[PDB]
Amino acid sequence: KPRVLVLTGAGISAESGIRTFRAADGLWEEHRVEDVGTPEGFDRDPELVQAFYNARRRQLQQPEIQPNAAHLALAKLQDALGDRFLLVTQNCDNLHERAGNTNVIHMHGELLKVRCSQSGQALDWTGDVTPEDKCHCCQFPAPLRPHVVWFGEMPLGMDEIYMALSMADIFIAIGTSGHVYPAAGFVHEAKLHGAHTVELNLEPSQVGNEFAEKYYGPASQVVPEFVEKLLKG
């Protein structure tokens, strides 16, 4: 069985009703990314930033937000390939987990976690973060921040991701925009180490000869059809 590495971005959770980074009007939920997605933004206006992620964390857990056919297909793919499968996601949502995927690498962190601003230790967290909310790891309780990787910060799990990029027989990018690095560079790394590269997306994430195989359309349509084709193949 082939080693398969899957990278997912915002596009896969779009049909589930989760909205992010349109590199068009430059807006995240009618916020400038500088203001809600950088360390400097958090430094300038922590109450705004905490409010923003409070809103995202709440919206994530609303009844109308469900994994879609694409998420389910990836859970089935992991079922079929077992340890020969790795899912890396740029997404901070828990929709892959709800669909049934396990050992998901959240390279940009998780909305349902916060982090101690002092120790850097993460903590499970489903509710709002208020100034009165402090860490569980220090004798003198420290402020908490979202466990989300901001532009300007280092992604998580990169050693493990680059190892898998080397090992992959097949690399699949799903719902990625191609504007966000280093994730957008993963296809180059995969192709350099001999992987067959596949893009499943609404719009091209990259210009030219990198993806050897490509299918475009709604994730809920393109992803299950590729996974089925892969599984019977």
């Binding site: 590199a23 990314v33 940009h108 990787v149 901001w150 532009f151 300007g152 910060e153 280092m154 992604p155 990169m158 680059y162 191609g178 504007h179 966000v180 690095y181 280093p182 957008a184 560079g185 210009v207």
Partner: peptide
């Protein structure tokens, strides 16, 4: 790989 960062063109 470097830090999370945005590219505007292409």
């Amino acid at each position: 790989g470097g830090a999370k960062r945005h590219r505007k063109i292409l």
